[PDB]
UniProtKB/Swiss-Prot annotation, chain A:
It comes from the Eukaryota. This is Large ribosomal subunit protein uL30m. Present with 1200 molecules/cell in log phase SD medium. The keyword Mitochondrion applies. It comes from Saccharomyces cerevisiae (strain ATCC 204508 / S288c) (Baker's yeast).
UniProtKB/Swiss-Prot annotation, chain B:
It holds the Pfam family L31. GO terms for molecular function: structural constituent of ribosome. It comes from Saccharomyces cerevisiae (strain ATCC 204508 / S288c) (Baker's yeast). This is Large ribosomal subunit protein mL60. Belongs to the mitochondrion-specific ribosomal protein mL60 family.
RNA sequence: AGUAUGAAAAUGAUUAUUUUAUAAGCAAUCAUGAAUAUAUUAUAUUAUAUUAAUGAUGUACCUUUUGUAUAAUGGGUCAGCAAGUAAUUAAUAUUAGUAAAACAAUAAGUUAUAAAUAAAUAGAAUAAUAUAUAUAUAUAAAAAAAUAUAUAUUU
RNA sequence: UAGCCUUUAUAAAUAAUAAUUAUUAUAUAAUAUAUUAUAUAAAGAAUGGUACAGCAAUUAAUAUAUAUUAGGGAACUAGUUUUUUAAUAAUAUUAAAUCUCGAAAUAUUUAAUUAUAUAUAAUAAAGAGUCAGAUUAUGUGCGAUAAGGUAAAUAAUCUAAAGGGAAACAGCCCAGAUUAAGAUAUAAAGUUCCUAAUAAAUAAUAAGUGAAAUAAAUAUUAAAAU
RNA sequence: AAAAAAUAAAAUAUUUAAAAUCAAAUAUAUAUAUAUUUGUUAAUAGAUAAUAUACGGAUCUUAAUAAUAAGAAUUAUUUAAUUCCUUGGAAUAUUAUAUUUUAAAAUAUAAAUACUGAAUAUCUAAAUAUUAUUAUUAUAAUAAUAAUAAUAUGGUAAUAGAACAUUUAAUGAUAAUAUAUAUUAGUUAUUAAUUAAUAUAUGUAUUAAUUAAAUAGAGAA
RNA sequence: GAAAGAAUUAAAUUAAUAUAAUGGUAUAACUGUGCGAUAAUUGUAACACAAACGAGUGAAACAAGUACGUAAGUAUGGCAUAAUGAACAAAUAACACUGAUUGUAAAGGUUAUUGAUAACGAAUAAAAGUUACGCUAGGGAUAACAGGGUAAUAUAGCGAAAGAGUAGAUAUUGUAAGCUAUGUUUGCCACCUCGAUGUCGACUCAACAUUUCCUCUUGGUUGUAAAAGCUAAGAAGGGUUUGACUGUUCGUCAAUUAAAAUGUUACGUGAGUUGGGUUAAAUACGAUGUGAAUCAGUAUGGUUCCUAUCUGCUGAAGGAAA
């Protein structure tokens, strides 16, 4: 099981302890998705930043490449070269 | 006070709805955190993900902060919370000992559910 | 204050296009009609260009400042001119040559080749890694601080 | 000179950060009144004296038809004595920058595990700039609980940050511009018009109260409830 | 005096509260045991200076009859139809429209996922940088360019990197079908250079390029 | 049953401690005592703490010796935390380290100690003023004035009502306290420029507010018989003065008037005036200072500019869409 955590809010008005916690967690920019294997340690860290973050549990995690592939929009065309 | 910080003493309807939504989101986050931990513990014991999700007896979190957050006396849910504590902080130097939450700096990020028992 | 040449700018007048006599501000940008101009593939229902219909948004620059549209500062405007450079040293980097030598080559010197110690004549394994040894305090020699030195080929 | 900055390297490398584990107890369970496991609860290793709270000692304040002391008085027959006094006791009731016997959270910080390694320390050889800050939030000293005040503390922004909001807006609310583009989520804030964008429920108001800068003791009229 | 009686319209107050009690709900054992949470006032007056009214402005409180049609744009608590149900639903009511029938009817289906909103994020292409794979062409363990992934790419003082314009020195073809210079119109992710047209000079580049020197770049005194 | 001991708990750190204050203290640091009088010693100090540096604080340990204690042992001054001072320059050692041709020496090193730099990180061995004759670089980074911020102050208002008011708190009166307003003043702040005289008063000219002085309407007023009034409401249309003195705003005073309101407007008003005051250079007077000079002192005297570009206002034309 994995927490899919997302940095919903910015770190602009945020004090330095909370910023440091966010950095440790692994979230860079706003809206940058990170999957974390569930445990007590990561849960407590997430609780510490509960108002900046959106968490949701998952069966499986996704690698960055997989996430990118999921994101990619449908090109509404099929090329045929001649 | 020649510089004009034109901030209204109370919130609009739309502001209040947004605040409520934000409060609901933090409760949801907490719920997700507890749920994931439970699922993990079920897996450790030796159940599948689906089986864990089904389980009648949900495991309560052992770490302290999480356990406190789960308690409504310490950290109430938005549905539990009073109208007043959603939209008014305790401010000892204000008249009424109360102040709009929107007047708190970084109120959109910072959480503040529980006010004192009689203030 | 040479001699040419001189579609360099600021600036004057005139004309042409185009806009402008119910509309209010760094005067622009963006949006967008319209008019005009030119165009040797405008095939055109074209392109570009010029232009304050028209609407949106838009508080010169600079210095100095906790902070400037600022009623703080400087400049009428254009053209020319105007400001981290040289000599003698020392240190660090990087590269190249050379290398336990280098530089220079007659010599002489400088730097490194030993660490030191205020300084003197003291100086780095008597069986190997500090538990060895070297110097300084101390001292019969030790131990104790510090720094330094030894683990085919010297750095 | 450090503090904060940069460049170029270094490794016995994770030392950096963050979080968790640590504890008390309860149930069951298995062993041997025992002690492991599990689960549940508890603001849950260690340090501290703030808020909070309290009136202990200390510093203060109150009240006694109390007592006792002596008395102020008082018939009487100096005593007894009676309506005052003071302290002190008794009981009860309170507060305090420099009291804290109760006592937070934040916090300080411990080891190991864990996640950050396109990441942190630490260290080598060098370059700086700064040492007029400001506001806003919070707890304060000062000030009249005055100031766009002043003195620090803490957090953030500004300073040095363009964008959206707050009519306008250095510092507030969001949010960080590499160059586009403009379909999809949105943030803060809004959705009659100006001005992008909405429709509902349920109360209550009648004063344009009000509608983004909430003016008071008090009077009145109402309304509930007891 | 005066009562279909209280169930509710009398006075005199206190009061302005969910502590307490009560109701509603959560949480534990659960045929309802405890604990936590939520639920208690309104309007007017007071009202108050000096260029000009100033909620930013307009303006906003709704009324059967009667328009497709309005009915806060204020305050309090909420929804994204509504009620149920466990975000996801079930039901149904609207709303729409269709159908085919006697404007209604009944069936059907959409659809109930509010919206605006930033230079945020994603998406869609471009650049540079870095780590990781590639592809190609030719310290190849290298380079040039191109790929895929990720991360970053605001900025004063300041640090570092890399470029360009200008002038001179060394080397140095070319040629008025050229060069130099200017205007305009182009092209090159564009301080620059280059194409073309045109004007003027000049029978010509210290010319391209590599270095090395700079009196090497001015809206700021 | 009794004695005696050993003590144990409680209480206490309020006593006391060399001395402030805090921290600690009875396991005692405090107190008595014997001995002693030595460790109030001598070399290396790791390592931390603190920390810019210079410094400072704890201190394991190694070594030499001393003291007390059966012994374990303890002792590198005091329960702790203040109790101090760089270098340079001399000095007195000590040292045996240099010894300028040699030998000595001189002198210098090394160690030991010494006296102050209290503006107490000490600029030299040694240095106060005044300037209205003043000057330059600057700052407005910290005062002048004017704006702003603020509202103690000042101005006005309200609730309450002690007390006046013959008799009655609310005719009229209204303490102390209470709550506001105001943004005029005296402050306070330094946020404006500190190239804002409009230098504070007058004149010219007014504009504006209304918190109404008169004038108009109207309530109350044993304190409205009448008339005078008092007090309050509405009300800003109109009107609200001339002299003596004073630089004066102000005030007193005279004479008036229906009344002679209160303000705001850069304490309205000079690129429109005046310049008397405050105001530089002369100057004298009292007081101050050794003196130059000084002063909230008093006094005589004493230089102000600008042809309007824009806005605005007053008039006047032309153009024009009629």
């Amino acid at each position: 099981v994995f927490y899919k955590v997302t940095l919903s809010r910015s770190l602009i008005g945020v004090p330095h302890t909370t910023k440091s916690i966010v950095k440790s967690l692994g979230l860079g920019k706003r809206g940058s998705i990170v999957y974390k294997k569930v445990n007590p340690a990561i849960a407590g860290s997430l609780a510490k930043v509960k108002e900046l973050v959106k968490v949701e549990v998952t069966e499986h995690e996704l690698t960055p490449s997989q996430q990118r592939e999921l994101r990619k929009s449908n090109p509404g065309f099929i090329v045929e070269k001649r | 006070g020649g510089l004009l910080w034109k901030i209204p003493w109370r919130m609009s309807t739309h502001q209040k709805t947004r605040q409520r939504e934000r409060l609901r989101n933090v409760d949801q986050v907490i719920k997700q955190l507890t749920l994931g931990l439970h699922v993990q513990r079920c897996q450790d014991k030796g159940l599948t993900y689906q089986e864990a999700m089904e389980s009648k007896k949900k495991y309560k979190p052992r770490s302290k902060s999480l356990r406190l957050l789960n308690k409504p006396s310490v950290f109430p849910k938005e549905n539990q919370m009073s109208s007043k504590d959603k939209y008014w902080t305790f401010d000892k130097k204000a008249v009424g000992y109360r102040k709009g939450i929107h007047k708190v700096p970084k109120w959109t990020k910072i959480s503040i559910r529980k006010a004192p028992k009689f203030f």
